[PDB]
Amino acid sequence: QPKRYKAHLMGTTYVYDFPELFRQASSSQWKNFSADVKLTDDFFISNELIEDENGELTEVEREPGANAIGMVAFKITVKTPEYPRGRQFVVVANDITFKIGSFGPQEDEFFNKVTEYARKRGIPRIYLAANSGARIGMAEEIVPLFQVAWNDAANPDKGFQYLYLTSEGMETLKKFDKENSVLTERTVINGEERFVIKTIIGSEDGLGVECLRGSGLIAGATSRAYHDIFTITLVTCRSVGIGAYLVRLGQRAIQVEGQPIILTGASALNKVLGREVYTSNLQLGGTQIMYNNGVSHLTAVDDLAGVEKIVEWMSYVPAKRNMPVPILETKDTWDRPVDFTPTNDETYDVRWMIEGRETESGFEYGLFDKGSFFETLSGWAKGVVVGRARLGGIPLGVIGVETRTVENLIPADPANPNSAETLIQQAGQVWFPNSAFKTAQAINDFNNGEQLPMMILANWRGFSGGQRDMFNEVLKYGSFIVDALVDYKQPIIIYIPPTGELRGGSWVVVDPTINADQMEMYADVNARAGVLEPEGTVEIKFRREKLLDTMNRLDDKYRELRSQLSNKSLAPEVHQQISKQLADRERELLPIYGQISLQFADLHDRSSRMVAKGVISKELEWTEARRFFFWRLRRRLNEEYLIKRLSHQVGEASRLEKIARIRSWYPASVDHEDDRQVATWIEENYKTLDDKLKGLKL
């Protein structure tokens, strides 16, 4: 087919061939899960969506390439490892072979209809971006008709005053039913009628501002969809203007290498700048721009690799809005200790704590299921590690802290000849503007559409408080974290891991009182927390007077010298010498007594003080954290389900009232603090509990 080769020439897959790529990715998903599984054709179904007589979207079986508009959609029903009976989603895509995949009023109204269709059903919306932005046009019927009112008809270079139509021109339009193509004002010059052109409208739709209204409509539709359903974009060919905005508005984006995300093309920018500044569109919106700045969460070598990453990302996501998170137990089961353990005297990659580490003596298992970590936003603000993982089969969002110094290259500005590339270095365990933004972005993306619970392996000394980072608005990005947590609707676990810490500046944005309905905090037996690091605490609270008071209690020499000063019959020069001896003993003891004060301060910063103060739920041992967190998260998910069931019944009541009612239904011998017992009893009694919900609503 010529349309297929036209798409290939543009560097993309022809739209009607994308469902087959989804079929291949879904088949590969089964092969990776269980090699022995035998798939039948019924495992994957793709039905095209088109508008019926009433303009309502409906599933149809028609020949491919029969689209009368540059936007197409498919409803996919697939049987997957997490949904063996089937899950559904919608795929919207521009047709790059239809008026260069430009967005006209009809493409925008169809895109909006498709977004609303997925939203109404609670199903994910996948967008395949391959376009040229808003459709551009002119009134072509006016091009061979317009006349010029010259200042001097003998000298054209003396200028013109206006453009006009003759009575013949007006008659041509009337004949063709195009009177409304122009707004004219009648005048008479040289005994001839001149219909001065006041505005050009055009009979053809899709020339200008109507395309722009459509752009705004779908920009708004996508902003709304992101809060409602799982949204993702694959940048499969260039994405321009509204197209670039749609990739960001859907938030989750996979960019095929060599496919740019642009606002204005390099050539047009060169025309406005009046010089050859930019060489390509890729220099403006390639992966080295968008993956590095977090607009693109992931890159793909080609379209199939991109479809594979979509399907893999979706494997952590509920089949539709408000369905439970999809459990997918693998051979790495919950009942094992954690093997990889970080130490303060050896450098580690957080990823080893998350997913485990392959060693010479075999695999060292991490907190989460082996092979389950799906890292995203990996090209941007690498000081924080974000991804999806599974805990004994339970999917969740994970935020970890990169302890190693991170460096990023800011490119030389081609528009500034005085500009050179800059290497920025950011210390580990510190939130900077970019990593604070990444953290808040990750919280939002796990919450909206994905509806995942979350674990944050909290390990920050604080925020970067230096001049550059303060000027670069670190306070704004840190505040986004608080907002993102207030909005969170699934269980959250804040866990200060072994070697980890939280201080005055970092604890403020992760404390469970930010969102008491969802959050809970735990600290490892080898974690630390306090307002300041011990060097800061002793500077405020273990000052010279306390240091001297300790020396007087604990040092024989200092105490002896100090007591000699109680003698009221001393010669002044003897007093001066023993007071000089005292001050010399202070100088001698100041370093080691300083170290004692640091140990004294450090002893307050322990998980045992956190437990005693009631600021953490429990102190934990790292090796046992997988076992503990699996049952805690399993129990919370069960309880959250019951809370929501009670919400749909007996009207309005507070969250505290709702769980207290649910927990009153547990056998009296059930210990509310025993997570495994609670989760087990709920699961053995879901149907009995369902009768209680329907009954105790009389």
Ligand X SMILES: CC(C)n1ncc2c1C(=O)CC1(CCN(C(=O)c3ccc4n[nH]cc4c3)CC1)C2
Write out the binding residues: 134-136, 238, 505, 541, 543
Positions in the binding site for ligand X (CB under 6 A): 264, 268-269, 271-273, 427, 430, 461-462, 464-466, 503, 505, 532-533, 535-536, 539
Question: Does 577 contact its own copies by CB under 8 A?
Answer: no
Question: Shortest Cβ distance from residue 237 to ligand X (Å)?
Answer: 20
How far is Cα 290 from Cα 304, in angstroms, rounded to an integer?
20
Question: Shortest Cβ distance from residue 529 to ligand X (Å)?
Answer: 11
Q: Which of 34, 190, 199, 361 binds its own copies (CB under 8 A)?
A: 199
Question: Does 37 contact its own copies by CB under 8 A?
Answer: no
Contact partner at residue 492 from its own copies, ligand X, none, CB < 5 to 8 Å by partner kind: none
Contact partner at residue 600 from its own copies, ligand X, none, CB < 5 to 8 Å by partner kind: its own copies
Bind-site residues for acetyl-CoA: 134-136, 505
Q: Which of 3, 4, 6, 224 binds its own copies (CB under 8 A)?
A: 224
Contact partner at residue 644 from its own copies, ligand X, none, CB < 5 to 8 Å by partner kind: none
Q: What angle do CA 644, 647, 652 make, to 5 degrees?
A: 150
Cβ proximity to ligand X: between 66 and 415 the closer is 415
Query: Of 219, 218, 250, which is closest to residue 127 (Cα–Cα)?
Result: 250
- Segment (H or E) for 273: helix 266-273
Question: Shortest Cβ distance from residue 501 to ligand X (Å)?
Answer: 9
Cβ proximity to its own copies: between 244 and 300 the closer is 244
Q: Which of 9, 37, 60, 138 binds its own copies (CB under 8 A)?
A: 138
Question: Does 482 contact its own copies by CB under 8 A?
Answer: yes
Question: Shortest Cβ distance from residue 404 to ligand X (Å)?
Answer: 14
Per DSSP, the three-state class of 195 is strand
Instruction: Name 501's bridge partners.
Output: 528
Ramachandran quadrant class, 553 (left: phi over 0; alpha: psi -120 to 50; beta: rest): alpha
Cβ proximity to its own copies: between 460 and 681 the closer is 460
Question: Does 471 contact its own copies by CB under 8 A?
Answer: yes
235 burial via Cβ count (<10 Å: 0-12, 13-18, 19+): buried
Residues in Cβ contact with 166 at an 8 Å cutoff, skipping those fewer than 6 apart: 147, 192, 193, 194, 195
Contact partner at residue 472 from ligand X, its own copies, none, CB < 5 to 8 Å by partner kind: its own copies
Bind-site residues for CoA: 238, 541, 543
- Segment (H or E) for 426: strand 422-426
Question: Does 190 contact its own copies by CB under 8 A?
Answer: no
Q: What does the DSSP 8-state code read for residue 286?
A: S
Q: Which of 404, 609, 627, 692 binds its own copies (CB under 8 A)?
A: 609
Count CB atoms within 10 A of the CB of residue 305: 16
Where in 385-444 is the site for its own copies (CB under 8 A)?
410-411, 413-416
Query: Of 528, 525, 529, which is closest to residue 623 (Cα–Cα)?
Result: 525
Cβ proximity to ligand X: between 135 and 297 the closer is 135
Contact partner at residue 183 from its own copies, ligand X, none, CB < 5 to 8 Å by partner kind: its own copies
Count CB atoms within 10 A of the CB of residue 486: 10
Question: Does 612 contact its own copies by CB under 8 A?
Answer: yes
Query: Of 617, 641, 640, which is closest to residue 629 (Cα–Cα)?
Result: 617
Question: Shortest Cβ distance from residue 378 to its own copies (Å)?
Answer: 17
Question: Shortest Cβ distance from residue 428 to ligand X (Å)?
Answer: 9
Note the helical H segments in 570-648.
Answer: 572-602, 607-613, 625-647
Question: Shortest Cβ distance from residue 534 to ligand X (Å)?
Answer: 8
Question: Does 200 contact its own copies by CB under 8 A?
Answer: yes
Query: Of 403, 406, 427, which is closest to residue 352 (Cα–Cα)?
Result: 403
How far is Cα 538 from Cα 601, in angstroms, rounded to an integer?
7
Q: Which of 554, 565, 583, 696 binds its own copies (CB under 8 A)?
A: 554
Where in 268-307 is the site for its own copies (CB under 8 A)?
268-269, 271, 277-278, 283-285, 289-290, 292-295
How far is Cα 409 from Cα 593, in angstroms, rounded to an integer?
44
Q: Are 403 and 350 in contact (CB under 8 A)?
A: yes
Cβ proximity to ligand X: between 470 and 554 the closer is 470
How far is Cα 644 from Cα 653, in angstroms, rounded to an integer?
12
Cβ proximity to its own copies: between 24 and 166 the closer is 166
Q: What angle do CA 402, 407, 413 make, to 5 degrees?
A: 140
Q: Are 297 and 309 in contact (CB under 8 A)?
A: no
Contact partner at residue 180 from its own copies, ligand X, none, CB < 5 to 8 Å by partner kind: its own copies
Contact partner at residue 606 from its own copies, ligand X, none, CB < 5 to 8 Å by partner kind: its own copies
Contact partner at residue 583 from ligand X, its own copies, none, CB < 5 to 8 Å by partner kind: none
Query: Of 492, 428, 409, 429, which is closest to residue 456 (Cα–Cα)?
Result: 492
Question: Does 136 contact its own copies by CB under 8 A?
Answer: yes
Question: Does 262 contact its own copies by CB under 8 A?
Answer: yes
Where in 141-160 is the site for its own copies (CB under 8 A)?
142-144, 146-148, 156-157, 159-160
How far is Cα 601 from Cα 578, in angstroms, rounded to an integer?
32
Cβ proximity to ligand X: between 101 and 133 the closer is 133
Residues in Cβ contact with 49 at an 8 Å cutoff, skipping those fewer than 6 apart: 57, 58, 59, 60, 73, 74, 75, 90, 114, 117
Question: Shortest Cβ distance from residue 224 to its own copies (Å)?
Answer: 6
Q: Which of 45, 305, 548, 596 binds its own copies (CB under 8 A)?
A: 596
